[PDB]
Amino acid sequence: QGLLAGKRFLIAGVASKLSIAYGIAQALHREGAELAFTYPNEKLKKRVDEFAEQFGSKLVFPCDVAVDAEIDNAFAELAKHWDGVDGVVHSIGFAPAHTLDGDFTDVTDRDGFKIAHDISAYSFVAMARAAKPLLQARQGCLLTLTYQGSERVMPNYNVMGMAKASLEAGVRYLASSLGVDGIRVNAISAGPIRTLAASGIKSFRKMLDANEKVAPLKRNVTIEEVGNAALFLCSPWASGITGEILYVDAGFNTVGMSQS
Amino acid sequence: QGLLAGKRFLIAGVASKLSIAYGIAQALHREGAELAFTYPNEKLKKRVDEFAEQFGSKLVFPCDVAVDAEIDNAFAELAKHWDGVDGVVHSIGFAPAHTLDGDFTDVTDRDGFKIAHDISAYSFVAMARAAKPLLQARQGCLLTLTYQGSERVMPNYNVMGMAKASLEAGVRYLASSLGVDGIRVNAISAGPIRTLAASGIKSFRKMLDANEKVAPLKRNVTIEEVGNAALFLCSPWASGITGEILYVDAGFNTVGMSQS
Amino acid sequence: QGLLAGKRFLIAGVASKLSIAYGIAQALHREGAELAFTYPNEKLKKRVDEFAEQFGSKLVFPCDVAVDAEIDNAFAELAKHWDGVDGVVHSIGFAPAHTLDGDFTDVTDRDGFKIAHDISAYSFVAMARAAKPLLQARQGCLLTLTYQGSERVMPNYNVMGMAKASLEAGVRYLASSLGVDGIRVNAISAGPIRTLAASGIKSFRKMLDANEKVAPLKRNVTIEEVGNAALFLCSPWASGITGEILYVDAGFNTVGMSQS
Amino acid sequence: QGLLAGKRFLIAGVASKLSIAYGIAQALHREGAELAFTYPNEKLKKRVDEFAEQFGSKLVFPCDVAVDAEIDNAFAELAKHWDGVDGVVHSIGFAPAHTLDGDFTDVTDRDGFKIAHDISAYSFVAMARAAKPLLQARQGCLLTLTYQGSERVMPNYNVMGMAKASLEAGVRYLASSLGVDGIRVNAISAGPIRTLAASGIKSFRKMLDANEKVAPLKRNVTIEEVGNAALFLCSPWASGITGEILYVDAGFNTVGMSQS
Numbered sequence A, B, C, D: 001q002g003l004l005a006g007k008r009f010l011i012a013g014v015a016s017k018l019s020i021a022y023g024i025a026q027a028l029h030r031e032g033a034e035l036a037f038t039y040p041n042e043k044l045k046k047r048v049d050e051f052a053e054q055f056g057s058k059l060v061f062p063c064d065v066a067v068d069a070e071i072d073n074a075f076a077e078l079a080k081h082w083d084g085v086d087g088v089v090h091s092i093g094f095a096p097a098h099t100l101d102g103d104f105t106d107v108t109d110r111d112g113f114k115i116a117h118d119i120s121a122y123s124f125v126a127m128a129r130a131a132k133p134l135l136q137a138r139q140g141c142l143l144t145l146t147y148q149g150s151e152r153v154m155p156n157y158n159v160m161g162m163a164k165a166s167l168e169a170g171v172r173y174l175a176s177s178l179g180v181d182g183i184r185v186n187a188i189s190a191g192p193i194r195t196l197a198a199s200g201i202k203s204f205r206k207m208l209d210a211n212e213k214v215a216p217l218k219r220n221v222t223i224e225e226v227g228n229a230a231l232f233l234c235s236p237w238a239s240g241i242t243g244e245i246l247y248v249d250a251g252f253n254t255v256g257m258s259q260s
């Protein structure tokens, strides 16, 4: 009987044990919560399926946010199992890798632009919509994962900075739209962490050595710290907070410039 | 021989004499600038043609930013007449009217989302791409028109707030990509102004009366003030300014709350 | 002893049961923490003495933040009782009441400015300094209470918005200075709450009805919501968070404007 | 007959020809404006006299902003000569040198804190107060100089970041207070420039070499660019802009991190 004793949460975005969604579910489950999970397609089905079993869960549903139907169906199927929900966790983001390696103006084609904002920004809205009925039942909350690359230019993040900026806008518009139903909508601007989202980025290690050099805490954050922060926002202790972007980056965002 | 004696500028987004692009072109031409124009489709050709000649210009090219080819071709044809360019003004934006009338989570369908970010956000980048060669010739600048609904939730702006947030992020990513070539990329966060962008918005009228009550200057801004500010950002006096979001809103953005 | 099992915390700024520090101390003690308290002068001593005892504490020390000596003594005396500290909560703020009633520029005198910035902004730094030794012992954290009037113009806040702006800056400079010692420095930007800080503000009730009308959650925050958030920032779950300004305002900060 | 034909502006803060105030006066005077000048004390009197003489001005008044009388007197004396004013330029800032060399928590004593916010933050309000009557005559404007060190932690800026945060807050509270009378209150967040404000800072060259390495334009800004930007804000072209913090930093503020 911890903090989330009796609470339910759906965790979309578990791709590996390094995924941020993993540390969240772990932190949430640690406090007594019951978890549900989605996977983008069959290839991930079996992996997410027993990630669920780690958390005492057998609720694993296919949800490709690119498909409108999959979203509603994934929530249709979930309505079949659960009465309501105390929160939905959206840890999804993607852009064609070519748009993230090279010059912004060059690699940012129309299609690469379309994909980035659809999967990474609109999905949180489409999910929030399909998830709205179940969230109201328990005055649940909504949580997404953003990155300060929306507010500040990082090399090679490119259209993902545009997407995250759009996402952050959606959080405010969702929190404002869903605030009347007791549904808090918040986001976490988490520091850089080497997950499966770092594959293909040749500069990452230098970037990590760099973030380590600038962060006020002189270190990079972990999915546990992120998970605990997510755990808080999804908790009754975070009842008075909506539309907030919380920076779990070791204060990195607050530094103008560091010793050479 | 005024301030822009001998400078050239392409004005995309002139649809009538109310268009913000119109008040900008007015300010530029007033200071000796040379003007070129595009139109979204044939229906506007004769109207833009008519405005172009009004400013001593006969350079009018079809440019539907939804079409990749139309963008580059409009710039291909423009290269035939002009050597280089000192600045590109991006006053274009659009989202399906249904996505701008009603509840955010509800009315924001996937397609309305795609269109909003495509026409209003990606186009400035695609244009920025197609315009680079002419900009490099004269170390021109880039200017777009944003709205503070990206930073704060306004009713009925909905997916346009996500788009403008993406746009404003792109400005930073563009200014950073094109900064090594002397090309300044900036944006103006202009106060609300009753142009053809207000068609279909039933609440616009009350919205305008509100800004009037809150803006520190107790008034709404004009396309002249926006045009005069745009004229400046496109001017050598703004040489030490890139990636800047300039708020020409009579200070409304800086007010937390006003007398009841 | 749940989250704050075995932790010690000094709470300066307990003036009544409505004080934000009160709801904070409540949340901390609720989670098993041992509490210490300061009082500004003799008149409050017996109340703070009594306030400490409500939380199983008899460690009550005089701390007038205007006096450098009074500051250090309270921590000298505290050093006598406690080895180290897991966090210091700075819930202090003050400006001459005249500076908060009328137009900002008329009422903003030099001394009212001096007092406001002295007591409300420098105090967190002087305290952070005198408290540094005890924080290093346990790598404690620092927490202060800010107000969004620093980022946005509210009527009658006047020099307190300038002071809060300085304070919020100090948090970043403190978090960066004390971050190498494991001391996270954060702040909570709490929504408006009718505490003893509302005495003399004739407009409070209308303002409270206003935030109630604007906050996405359609309500005003409580010292419990504020206290729980402080509990988090003072908790190991907030280990990856420093220099952060956390908004416990029911998302009010995220609303550009709502139907009036 | 340029842009400021017939406009008057007072330039407080001219200490040398490198001072930002100098490049502004030059830019304003270049466009036909008439100039007045103050000096902090006797030692600078003859020097300010000489610069005023450069700009066709012999209006030089003693103004130590630390003395309330000097402020009002300087404006009393100025009111005698000029009818009204189209703008007041506040280019003053100071903090005890000891508070700007070392660790923030250490060197920030109570007095060093008092002085910094007094001279650098309160002066703009006291001057804005003493300047209000002359500004109303011509619907003048107010301009101050801020630094992004208020929003982000720079090494050794320390308490000056708190002051700049207060200063920047005052701009909004001033712009909001004076906006109803047509007086626009704005500020320029100018990049680092080696003026007489850099004396005693051993780290400057590395800091400057860094900004040069990070600034999107790969260069540092000049007082001419700042002066031209100030000229704009003090101009009718900036009529729709109040309470705005304009970043003349070569876009440096918009960069999260650069190639190592």
Ligand SMILES: NC(=O)c1ccc[n+]([C@@H]2O[C@H](COP(=O)([O-])OP(=O)(O)OC[C@H]3O[C@@H](n4cnc5c(N)ncnc54)[C@H](O)[C@@H]3O)[C@@H](O)[C@H]2O)c1
Binding pocket: A012, A013, A014, A015, A016, A018, A019, A020, A021, A039, A040, A063, A064, A065, A066, A090, A091, A092, A093, A094, A119, A145, A146, A147, A148, A189, A190, A191, A192, A193, A194, A195, A196, A197, A198
């Ligand atoms: N890794 C970082 O440094 C970082 C920092 C800040 C924010 N974020 C964001 O946090 C979120 C989680 O990233 P991560 O670190 O866990 O990497 P990850 O690859 O381990 O997890 C991201 C998940 O998005 C899923 N996904 C992608 N496309 C999908 C689709 N069409 N339908 C359904 N699911 C889809 C992926 O399957 C994956 O599980 C992302 O949005 C990311 O942008 C990441």
Ligand SMILES: NC(=O)c1ccc[n+]([C@@H]2O[C@H](COP(=O)([O-])OP(=O)(O)OC[C@H]3O[C@@H](n4cnc5c(N)ncnc54)[C@H](O)[C@@H]3O)[C@@H](O)[C@H]2O)c1
Binding pocket: B012, B013, B014, B015, B016, B018, B019, B020, B021, B022, B039, B040, B063, B064, B065, B066, B090, B091, B092, B093, B094, B119, B145, B146, B147, B189, B190, B191, B192, B193, B194, B195, B196, B197, B198
């Ligand atoms: N009108 C306001 O209140 C206001 C305030 C602040 C910012 N803005 C934004 O600044 C810009 C100024 O717009 P405006 O005031 O001149 O209104 P406007 O309607 O007159 O101009 C918008 C132009 O975008 C063009 N356009 C739309 N879709 C296109 C496409 N697929 N291809 C090519 N062109 C296309 C339209 O033809 C139009 O000329 C807009 O982006 C607007 O969102 C508007």
Ligand SMILES: NC(=O)c1ccc[n+]([C@@H]2O[C@H](COP(=O)([O-])OP(=O)(O)OC[C@H]3O[C@@H](n4cnc5c(N)ncnc54)[C@H](O)[C@@H]3O)[C@@H](O)[C@H]2O)c1
Binding pocket: C012, C013, C014, C015, C016, C018, C019, C020, C021, C039, C040, C063, C064, C065, C066, C090, C091, C092, C093, C094, C119, C145, C146, C147, C189, C190, C191, C192, C193, C194, C195, C196, C197, C198
């Ligand atoms: N109530 C709100 O709406 C609100 C919202 C956001 C932030 N805050 C801030 O929270 C903090 C606590 O205020 P509150 O709302 O709990 O009201 P409060 O009156 O109960 O507490 C204010 C505290 O300021 C302390 N103080 C003042 N001068 C002092 C001195 N010279 N020496 C030592 N201590 C001194 C006092 O100990 C007092 O307890 C304030 O800084 C306030 O600005 C308040």
Ligand SMILES: NC(=O)c1ccc[n+]([C@@H]2O[C@H](COP(=O)([O-])OP(=O)(O)OC[C@H]3O[C@@H](n4cnc5c(N)ncnc54)[C@H](O)[C@@H]3O)[C@@H](O)[C@H]2O)c1
Binding pocket: D013, D014, D015, D016, D018, D019, D020, D021, D039, D040, D063, D064, D065, D066, D090, D091, D092, D093, D094, D119, D145, D146, D147, D188, D189, D190, D191, D192, D193, D194, D195, D196, D197, D198
């Ligand atoms: N140097 C930069 O990079 C930079 C950038 C942005 C803003 N600023 C700030 O804007 C202003 C521009 O500074 P600068 O570059 O011209 O350096 P500067 O040293 O040449 O000018 C500072 C002036 O403030 C005057 N002054 C100091 N104390 C005073 C007092 N008690 N009363 C009256 N006057 C007093 C000084 O005499 C001096 O003329 C400063 O406040 C500065 O902090 C500086």
Ligand SMILES: Cc1c(CN(C)C(=O)/C=C/c2cnc3c(c2)CC[C@@H](N)C(=O)N3)oc2ccccc12
Binding pocket: A093, A094, A095, A096, A097, A100, A147, A154, A155, A156, A157, A158, A160, A192, A196, A197, A198, A199, A200, A201
């Ligand atoms: C930091 C940082 C991140 C992590 N992060 C904040 C994200 O949101 C990550 C988005 C992201 C989306 N799509 C991707 C990839 C990543 C690469 C995985 C690959 N498998 C792929 O095809 N597509 O990504 C970066 C990219 C460039 C520069 C910096 C960063």
Ligand SMILES: Cc1c(CN(C)C(=O)/C=C/c2cnc3c(c2)CC[C@@H](N)C(=O)N3)oc2ccccc12
Binding pocket: B093, B094, B095, B096, B097, B100, B147, B154, B155, B156, B157, B160, B192, B196, B197, B198, B199, B200, B201
């Ligand atoms: C403010 C404000 C604006 C002006 N503004 C800042 C914009 O950027 C306006 C974008 C906008 C894009 N697409 C539109 C329309 C407008 C309506 C024209 C119609 N013809 C249409 O089909 N599509 O529009 C609003 C809409 C709803 C709520 C508030 C606002």
Ligand SMILES: Cc1c(CN(C)C(=O)/C=C/c2cnc3c(c2)CC[C@@H](N)C(=O)N3)oc2ccccc12
Binding pocket: C093, C094, C095, C096, C097, C100, C147, C154, C155, C156, C157, C160, C192, C196, C197, C198, C199, C200, C201
């Ligand atoms: C909101 C809001 C607050 C609460 N809050 C966020 C604060 O930070 C409160 C500061 C504050 C500082 N000093 C004060 C007082 C208040 C009045 C108590 C009295 N005892 C006094 O002498 N001095 O106060 C306001 C004042 C004017 C307008 C709005 C507000």
Ligand SMILES: Cc1c(CN(C)C(=O)/C=C/c2cnc3c(c2)CC[C@@H](N)C(=O)N3)oc2ccccc12
Binding pocket: D093, D094, D095, D096, D097, D100, D147, D154, D155, D156, D157, D158, D160, D192, D196, D197, D198, D199, D200, D201
């Ligand atoms: C950058 C940067 C600046 C320039 N800048 C933006 C400012 O506003 C500088 C204000 C400033 C105020 N007071 C000062 C001094 C400067 C040193 C002159 C000396 N004579 C003194 O006693 N007092 O100053 C810095 C100080 C430390 C670290 C970095 C910087």
